[PDB]
Ligand binder design. Sequence first.
Ligand SMILES: O=C1NC=C[C@@H](O)N1
Ligand SMILES: O=C1NC=C[C@@H](O)N1
Ligand SMILES: [Zn+2]
Ligand SMILES: [Zn+2]
Lengths: 166, 164
Amino acid sequence: GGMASKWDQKGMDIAYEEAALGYKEGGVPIGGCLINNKDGSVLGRGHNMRFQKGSATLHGEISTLENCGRLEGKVYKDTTLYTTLSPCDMCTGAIIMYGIPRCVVGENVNFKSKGEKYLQTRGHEVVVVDDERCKKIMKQFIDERPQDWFEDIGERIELQKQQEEE
Amino acid sequence: GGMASKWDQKGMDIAYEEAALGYKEGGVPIGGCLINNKDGSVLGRGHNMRFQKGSATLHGEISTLENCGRLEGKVYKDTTLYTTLSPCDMCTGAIIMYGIPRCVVGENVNFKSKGEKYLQTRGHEVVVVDDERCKKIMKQFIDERPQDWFEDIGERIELQKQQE
Ligand SMILES: O=C1NC=C[C@@H](O)N1
Ligand SMILES: O=C1NC=C[C@@H](O)N1
Ligand SMILES: [Zn+2]
Ligand SMILES: [Zn+2]
């Protein structure tokens, strides 16, 4: 939105602060926030809680939504969800279920799912910022903790295939 | 298929009991469980926690997954997720992200989203068992607390919608 996009620097800066905090906490460094496009108010902010809470569902986007609390359905229809990393299929589904019209993404180089396109197929706007702070922190985690990263995205580790590929 | 579907009555009974417990607790009566298809072991069970925990994300399916705990990706690839109600787009996305191959649905009369079909488009099996217990409990909640139900699927009640 010409007016909604005005909040994009604010939103990605908060999302990165959440990612960096999650990193410090030993977690997956993915952060988010939800902003009311009408007035730039931050409805909530969060980061991935898999390590901090032993959680299979609290991706950064899900944790962000959880932290906004229960809201009337109409509220979400004029918000932007900021996520430091392009959303997986689960977080994509959350944006779709709530009718959040815009998803602003820090980077899609370290990870992208079919959800990035599916959002747009389903009528939601996606903007990729290519934020190098997000890319660096996520790349460090993926490089150092691939077993934990594959867990977070539900990917079966197929070492026989990887040994043949390399 | 035979080894997986042999658990479908067990799984829906567990999911229904979770729904009924959520009902007793004052919540949305939607329950689930995740079963390992190889041996019928129950990895976890759960119900919607919106009212119990002030939660915008703990749908029945999400709470079920949360209650299974952290699991390596391989575990999910031979499971069935049982849900008393056909999954919204969010819970559909969770099933897809974890690669859970089978979703057995109590009913899709009180609710269905585009996710039911999207699961199949993405290669997952969906079975709807039309469980009368599930239909009745959900209909009861919707009739008594319609605004709360609409809040659970992020929709506002509006007369224009039903009025053409
Ligand atoms: O926390 C997250 N983990 C993986 C991808 C993204 O959806 N968010
Ligand atoms: O708890 C739930 N609420 C709505 C639909 C379904 O995904 N489950
Ligand atoms: Zn995600
Ligand atoms: Zn759901």
